[PDB]
Write a protein that binds this DNA or RNA. Structure first.
Length: 93
DNA sequence: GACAGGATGTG
DNA sequence: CACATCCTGTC
């Protein structure tokens, strides 16, 4: 219902349901996560925001904007792996 | 292709 | 603001 949802909140919600482990999962105990099925998560993000043409190219650009915002960072050298900068703070928020 | 980040546009 | 879209470049 809430269409104001942000990408990081949405990704947090996906990682919270173990039934989504197939496409996105935690890869550390400190906030690192991997987009196992990147195009699949991008598809879900588009449906959520009603942007039918959403894909990883664009979902990843949205994640790149987080770097300076200190919300999410890239885990260098690790394909599709990013990290929530302030974890678990963002969780209990 | 994945990834970085600038340019322009939208609500 | 918070992306969505498109693009130049690197590797």
């Amino acid at each position: 219902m809430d269409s104001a949802i942000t990408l990081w909140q949405f990704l947090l919600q996906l990682l919270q349901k173990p039934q989504n482990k197939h496409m996105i999962c935690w890869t550390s105990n400190d906030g690192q996560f991997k987009l196992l099925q990147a195009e699949e998560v991008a598809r879900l993000w588009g449906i959520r925001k009603n942007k039918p043409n959403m894909n990883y190219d664009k979902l990843s650009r949205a994640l790149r904007y987080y770097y300076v915002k200190n919300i999410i960072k890239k885990v260098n050298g690790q394909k599709f792996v990013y990290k929530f900068v302030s974890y678990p703070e963002i969780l209990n928020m």
